[PDB]
Symmetry: D3
Subunit: 59 residues, 6 copies
């Protein structure tokens, strides 16, 4: 499985490593898939590059 996770910028490397580990484990146990087969990629966004209801996340 391959998971792309889109998150706001601003977290530490440690928090992102935790995110990757916990998500990978959740995918593996949910699907009964080998942990080694799970790939995760994180993509960060500035709040000025994200919209909800047409309004910037930054407001």
């Amino acid at each position: 499985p391959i998971a792309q996770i889109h998150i706001y910028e601003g977290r530490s490397d440690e928090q992102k490593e935790t995110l990757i580990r916990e998500v990978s484990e959740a995918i593996s146990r949910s699907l009964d898939a080998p942990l080694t087969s799970v790939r995760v990629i994180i993509t960060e966004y500035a709040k000025g590059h994200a919209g909800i209801g047409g309004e910037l996340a930054s407001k």
Copy 2:
């Protein structure tokens, strides 16, 4: 946060429901983000549409 999870076809409804719940919870606790803000989209693939090392997953 938004997670797009690419998985092989053939998982049960129950496993997919678990996937959505467990991944959402993992994202929420890892990022200290409200669970209600976490969105997940599952996309399924035939093994004939996936490659590893240039070879079909189906072989």
Copy 3:
């Protein structure tokens, strides 16, 4: 520019055609990019394949 638009299944052909046109026009005028350069791809999802708050969209 390339837009990938993820929507729930169940829209009409007419609404999808409108979506493509109106989004393309919005991208073109917002960015001052030639309309001919704007590409849109629509991807549909069953509500059973979408989660909000850890719950299936088909439930909430």
Copy 4:
């Protein structure tokens, strides 16, 4: 609805805000979906990271 828009780098914050608003409104009226349900994420690319016909956009 969730829209991911891939654009070249170099626009101002104001132009990108306009992009987000106008695209969101277009999605909402095209689909008769509540505006509040529409999410947009912008991803920028350097012209050396985009290819057309095998050739760099730059």
Copy 5:
């Protein structure tokens, strides 16, 4: 490396297998990355779900 390739529906199984192999090889030599590390996922689209210049690919 992970490649997602978006193509129109209607290609043969053989062409898709070739696509996976040839793209994977191109990635491997371009990046000097081991072929075994390259993953490809193909996604097909109906021409009614693709727009060019605001017009459906199907017209």
Copy 6:
């Protein structure tokens, strides 16, 4: 066709240009599709943003 290629950061502009050209040509010959119709977008990732087996690539 549109290809999105996710790669680790650290390659030169020249290597990325080669990637774009060689991938585009591979798509074109594999599908018998005109080279001019093939678009490629590259996205780079830090090794701290990539997981294999739940562990950081770095």
